[PDB]
Amino acid sequence: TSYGDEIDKFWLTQYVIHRESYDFYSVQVDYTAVGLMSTPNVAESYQSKFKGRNGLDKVLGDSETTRVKINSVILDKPHGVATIRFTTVRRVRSNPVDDQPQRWIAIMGYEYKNAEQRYVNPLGFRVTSYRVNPE
Amino acid sequence: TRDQTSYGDEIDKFWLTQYVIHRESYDFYSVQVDYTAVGLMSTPNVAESYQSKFKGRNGLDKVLGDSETTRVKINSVILDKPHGVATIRFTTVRRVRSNPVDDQPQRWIAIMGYEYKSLAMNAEQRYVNPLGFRVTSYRVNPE
Numbered sequence A: 001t002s003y004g005d006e007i008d009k010f011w012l013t014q015y016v017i018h019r020e021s022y023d024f025y026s027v028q029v030d031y032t033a034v035g036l037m038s039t040p041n042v043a044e045s046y047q048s049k050f051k052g053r054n055g056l057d058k059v060l061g062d063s064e065t066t067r068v069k070i071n072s073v074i075l076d077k078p079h080g081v082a083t084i085r086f087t088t089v090r091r092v093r094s095n096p097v098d099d100q101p102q103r104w105i106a107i108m109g110y111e112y113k114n115a116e117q118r119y120v121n122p123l124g125f126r127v128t129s130y131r132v133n134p135e
Numbered sequence B: 001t002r003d004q005t006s007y008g009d010e011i012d013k014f015w016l017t018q019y020v021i022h023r024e025s026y027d028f029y030s031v032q033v034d035y036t037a038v039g040l041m042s043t044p045n046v047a048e049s050y051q052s053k054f055k056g057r058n059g060l061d062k063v064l065g066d067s068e069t070t071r072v073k074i075n076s077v078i079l080d081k082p083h084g085v086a087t088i089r090f091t092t093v094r095r096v097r098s099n100p101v102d103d104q105p106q107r108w109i110a111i112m113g114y115e116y117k118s119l120a121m122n123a124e125q126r127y128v129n130p131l132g133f134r135v136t137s138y139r140v141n142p143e
């Protein structure tokens, strides 16, 4: 539907933070929220990295982490697309210092449309398209 | 849409900081929206107290107009979800248009009480407060 720019930027940036970060303790909720907030087509594309004994949570486990910081969020409400530019920083538990930051661009399409969704996606936020690219 | 005291850390933190920004900033080109957002997000008591400064020939926007502006910067947020209480430390920086530089920043502590209510809401009201967030108590003090 339509809820306002700042409401859009919250779910959009909260989505990027859920999907582009890695912390073993939070992968459960981070993984779940990405589902409700994604179309099944875009959802399975994300779930591909967690299947089998080679899944990210299985292979990486707790050895490292990756944090996200949002730097800008532009909107296009009539069309339902947004361009988010964020930065990630990786670090393994044994790492001496954090890895050099990496800059990214997220081209996203969103829309609005269960008791578990209460503390995750009450407004029915859903991402229909997603594409991350470097800078 | 529902009566709940909390919606989670990141959701509560969004509305609480949104409330402080709408109520503690001053932008003439936006004050009408801010004034409306604060009223929707507040109980009648909290709303009546806030709207006092806008009444009369000496209402805030009637006096200040576009001569000055004040922007907010959120520093930290501490939630007590079970009791609908939150502490928000923020900074304001005022710029008088008739000055070359800005005023010196001011630091504040906001003690707030919040809740969510399922209240009848029109289209334009749901577009701004979909989850029915509202402040039940509001007190600002310097730090």
Ligand SMILES: O=C(O)c1ccnc(-c2ccco2)c1
Binding pocket: B022, B023, B024, B025, B026, B027, B031, B034, B035, B038, B070, B092
């Ligand atoms: O000049 C200020 O810092 C100030 C103080 C109290 N309310 C406001 C305000 C403007 C629009 C909504 O709320 C601004």
